[PDB]
Design a binder for this molecule. Structure first.
Ligand SMILES: *[C@@H]1O[C@H](CO)[C@@H](O)[C@H](O)[C@H]1NC(C)=O
Length: 982
């Protein structure tokens, strides 16, 4: 109604061709509700585009306001008129089912009058299309003959499709559905759908009786049969519906797999990165390392955590074995890789690994068969990188955007290292080098930058770092494009002279280190300059700078490379020891730049080692949880130089090694953390709010409701973040509106660089938004619409995380959830399977003294308490009940005193079943392992935890409570004095 497309098209038809796109996007309304005076600030074009945008937006705004004021009534009772869009730019189909039957055969049967017949059987695919088999025959006597296409029309009449959410969190009530399609023109199917029982979730079909429904599907129509399942188990479980048609013989039934995940958000934490050099660090040829247990403070109740320890026989072994392989190469980092620079995972790690293995010659024992695989990986990576190449021989950060000098230099540096491996086109690299030298170099010897910055930048210490980086890039292509590009040595000399001229005024550690490495490559690192390089190191162990974490790692890598270029082997071992330590995220490093720089520095150190050898590590692990001692020996010419061990419990152990080498140890733990807003955000301030959509407007047919998610983020630092990323994890059944994201990205305004809906997202669907920068002065806000397709109750909150790519230390996490609780399935049996947990099978209404005595202190039970409720802290996922201990009938593995306080944590689904109240007395007994605290000493209301509401003393005199007060008192006295007979 409010689109008003006709006059929009009319106005656009009266503008020049180049200005049509500028005005077309000036009329469509963005979801953030921005007046076009503010929107014009985001237009990265000329003043003509800004003027046209502003004029068109004001015109259409006034026009549509008048239309909505005149022809819209709130009491009309007549539906608003809808106009067909009648758009242009229509795109033809481009997705067709993949081809099959890619096999060759030779006819060998005895010919009959020249014709040889061969009978071949094929298995038709499950696509409802019409295949066209194409046959071509080759014979040495007659030649090539092309047969006519053969048409195989696959058809079906009744189709059952089972609609499921991607993943439903445990203890979430979700309505999966089965859609039955009838394709008969004038026939009505009479199907008998049935839901098979599954132990994992209590369907409406109990084990005693299966659930069957007879539904009639109208001709040329479809019917949806909704089902409700609540999952109480984790993993992947099968949902099956069996449908049998009447009088049509069709018995089609569809089975699908549903993934159910714990309530929290899975995280990987590093607890130990200790190096292994017993010859020097150890006491006397023996090293002892004490490994503390992981924190696991915020672990989600009833969720197992797995700890893994990895033994490196070489500081470079893990990255090498990861880079050579394909399915594991993507795990070197923990960040997305969808832009210009981050797309170097395919090329740089594999290139460095291949070069290091070649110059060390470890292929004979590692396996020469893998080299071709690595080459293929590099080829694929190179094929991807050409997507970012502008026609002007320059590489841009994103597709079809301003070319970046820094990225072009990095690409040239990586390409110059791979010509000896794969068939890198010389035209591309030479054109990039020529572009860098001609169009971006100032006469003074400084490389200009015009595109928005990607890394961290009188303009001093900014041009120095960029010039040093570009010089390091050019020194790799010195002998490659020397013939196509002539003035390269002059540019290198000018850049080196400029670097030497202003090298004494540097103050930051990063610029000092990078300029020192550039000079050491050029050979000008001599005299007082060398002293400036050495004195910058703090503790003679690192080129550290306060605040920055990954930049410090990169600068230390540059310094180590410079030291190697200086042919020094005394100041290096401390730097190598420090660099092997800073593995914060997972088992390795976070970003790509720091990872690649450490890889390069360590590989260079290993290459120039004076035949170090002496790799005879023998690591003995004394795990308290295991009676038998664990031992691994890693000698030279071993199989993989990597040894991994796994544990299902959190504990601290000790590591013993006997020397003869320099190994590394890394311990990482995997667990789930409760959905709580991060207490302290290092540098980003984030606020995320989800609200119902003011008007339905355009909604997908399947979507049940639409909501608007609005995110506002700001950078608390002095300068804008170099590059930042929004990782948005979404609740069950929710999908974003792709039209809004496309409008945000592709539009002239370009609020977001690009969006990516495809990731691993093993837990829940994730959306990644690449923000070019975050403004420190004011909040940067963006909003888009998310639609729900499956209705859900007790829905868990979603997470939004904003972090700087090149420095992952500065990240902020927030949680959003739509605004007692209401369920959707309370029936005779469905309300009981959900509530079957957190309680015992007793109904707490007909409790007998004998039954209570028998079930009170069963050998499984290890504690029985009589406490009082202090307060109720109801939360989104787990409720907190702080119980004041009144008297402990018996004591177990946990020590308490009268008057002390404890806290019990209960699942949200059991809030109504518990129905606890303020300032009331209760009696609970439970198992021995029902203690959660390691301090807090929290307890979990499990399946063997009893809850009885102790009547108040003044209310014990009523008819409905005197029958129970005396029984409870007698029971308590009997167990206090007489104890348990059994
Ligand atoms: C956590 O670390 C382990 C051990 O290195 C790894 O297998 C796992 O993939 C990592 N994280 C996740 C979220 O799976």
């Amino acid at each position: 109604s409010v689109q008003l497309t006709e006059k929009r098209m009319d106005k656009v038809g009266k503008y020049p061709k180049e200005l049509r796109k500028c005005c077309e996007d000036g009329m469509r309304e963005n979801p953030m509700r921005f007046s076009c005076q503010r929107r014009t600030r985001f237009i990265s074009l000329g003043e003509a585009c800004k003027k046209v945008f502003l004029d068109c937006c004001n015109y259409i705004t006034e026009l549509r306001r008048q239309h909505a004021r005149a022809s819209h009534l709130g009491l009309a009772r007549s539906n608003l008129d809808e106009d067909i869009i009648a758009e242009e730019n229509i795109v033809s189909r481009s997705e067709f089912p993949e081809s099959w039957l890619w096999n060759v055969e030779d006819l060998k049967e005895p010919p009959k009058n020249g014709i040889s017949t061969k009978l071949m059987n094929i298995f038709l695919k499950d696509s409802i299309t019409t295949w066209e088999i194409l046959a071509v025959s080759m014979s040495d006597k007659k030649g090539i003959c092309v047969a006519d296409p053969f048409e195989v029309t696959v058809m079906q009449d009744f189709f059952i499709d089972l609609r499921l959410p991607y993943s439903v969190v445990r203890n979430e009530q979700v309505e999966i559905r089965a859609v039955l399609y009838n394709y008969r023109q004038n026939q009505e199917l009479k199907v008998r759908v049935e839901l098979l029982h599954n132990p994992a979730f209590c369907s409406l079909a109990t084990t005693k009786r299966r659930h069957q429904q007879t539904v009639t599907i109208p001709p040329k129509s479809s019917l949806s049969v909704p089902y409700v399942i609540v999952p109480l188990k984790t993993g992947l479980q099968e949902v099956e519906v069996k449908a049998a048609v009447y009088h049509h013989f069709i018995s089609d039934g569809v089975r699908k797999s549903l993934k159910v995940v714990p309530e929290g958000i899975r995280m990987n934490k590093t607890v130990a990165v200790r190096t292994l050099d017993p010859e020097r660090l150890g006491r006397e040829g023996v090293q002892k390392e004490d490994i503390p247990p992981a924190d696991l403070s915020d672990q989600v109740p009833d969720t197992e955590s797995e700890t893994r320890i990895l033994l490196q026989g070489t500081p470079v072994a893990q990255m090498t074995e990861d880079a050579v392989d394909a399915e594991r190469l993507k795990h070197l980092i923990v960040t997305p890789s969808g832009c210009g620079e981050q797309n170097m995972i395919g090329m740089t790690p594999t290139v460095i690994a291949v070069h290091y293995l070649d110059e060390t010659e470890q292929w004979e024992k590692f396996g020469l068969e893998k080299r071709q695989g690595a080459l293929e990986l590099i080829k694929k990576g190179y094929t991807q990188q050409l997507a970012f190449r502008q026609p002007s021989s320059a590489f841009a950060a994103f597709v079809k955007r301003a070319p970046s000098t820094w990225l072009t230099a990095y690409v040239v540096k990586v390409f110059s290292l791979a010509v000896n491996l794969i068939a890198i086109d010389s035209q591309v690299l030479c054109g990039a080098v020529k572009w860098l030298i001609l169009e971006k170099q100032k006469p003074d010897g400084v490389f200009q930058e015009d595109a928005p910055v990607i890394h961290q930048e009188n303009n001093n210490e900014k041009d120095m770092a960029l010039t040093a980086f570009v010089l390091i890039s050019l020194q790799e292509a010195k002998d490659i494009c020397e013939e196509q590009v002539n003035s390269l040595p002059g540019s290198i000399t000018k850049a080196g002279d400029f670097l030497e001229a202003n090298y004494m005024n540097l103050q930051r550690s990063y610029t000092v280190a990078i300029a020192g490495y550039a000079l050491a490559q050029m050979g000008r690192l001599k005299g007082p300059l060398l002293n400036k390089f050495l004195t910058t190191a703090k503790d003679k162990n690192r080129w550290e700078d306060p605040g920055k974490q990954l930049y410090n790692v990169e600068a230390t890598s540059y310094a180590l490379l410079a030291l190697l270029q200086l042919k020094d082997f005394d100041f290096v071992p401390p730097v190598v020891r420090w660099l092997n330590e800073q593995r914060y995220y997972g088992g390795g490093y976070g970003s790509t730049q720091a990872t690649f720089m450490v890889f390069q520095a360590l590989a260079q150190y290993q290459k120039d080692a004076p035949d170090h050898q002496e790799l005879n590590l023998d690591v003995s692990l004394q795990l308290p949880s295991r009676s038998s001692k664990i031992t691994h020996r890693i000698h030279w010419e071993s199989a993989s130089l990597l040894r991994s061990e796994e544990t299902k419990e959190n504990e601290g152990f000790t590591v013993t090694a006997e020397g003869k080498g320099q190994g590394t140890l890394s311990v990482v733990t995997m667990y789930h953390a409760k959905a709580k807003d991060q207490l302290t955000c290092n540098k980003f301030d984030l606020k995320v709010t989800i609200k119902p959509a003011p008007e339905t407007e355009k909604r997908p047919q399947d979507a049940k409701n639409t909501m608007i998610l609005e995110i506002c983020t700001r950078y608390r630092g002095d300068q804008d973040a170099t590059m930042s990323i929004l990782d948005i994890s979404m609740m069950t059944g929710f999908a974003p509106d792709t039209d809004d994201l496309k409008q945000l990205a592709n539009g002239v305004d370009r609020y977001i660089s690009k969006y990516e809906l495809d990731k691993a997202f093993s837990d829940r669907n994730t959306l990644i938004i690449y923000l070019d920068k975050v403004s420190h002065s004011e909040d940067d806000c963006l909003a888009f619409k998310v639609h729900q397709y499956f209705n859900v109750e007790l829905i868990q909150p979603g997470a939004v995380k904003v972090y700087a790519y090149y420095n992952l230390e500065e990240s902020c996490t927030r949680f959003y959830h739509p605004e007692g609780k209401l369920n959707k399935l309370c029936r005779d049996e469905l309300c009981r399977c959900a509530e079957e947990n957190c309680f015992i099978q007793k109904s707490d209404d007909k409790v007998t003294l004998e039954e209570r005595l028998d079930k009170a202190c069963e050998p499984g039970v290890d504690y029985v308490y009589k406490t009082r409720l202090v307060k109720v802290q109801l939360s989104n996922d787990f409720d907190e009940y702080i119980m004041a201990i009144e008297q402990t009938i018996k004591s177990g593995s946990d020590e308490v005193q009268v008057g002390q306080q404890r806290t019990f944590i209960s699942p949200i689904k059991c809030r109504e079943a518990l129905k606890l109240e303020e300032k009331k007395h209760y009696l609970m007994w439970g198992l021995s392992s029902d203690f959660w605290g390691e301090p807090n000493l929290s307890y979990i209301i499990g399946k063997d935890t009893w809850v009885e509401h102790w009547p108040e003393e003044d209310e014990c005199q009523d008819e409905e409570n005197q029958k129970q007060c005396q029984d409870l008192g007698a029971f308590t006295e009997s167990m206090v004095v007489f104890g348990c007979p059994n």
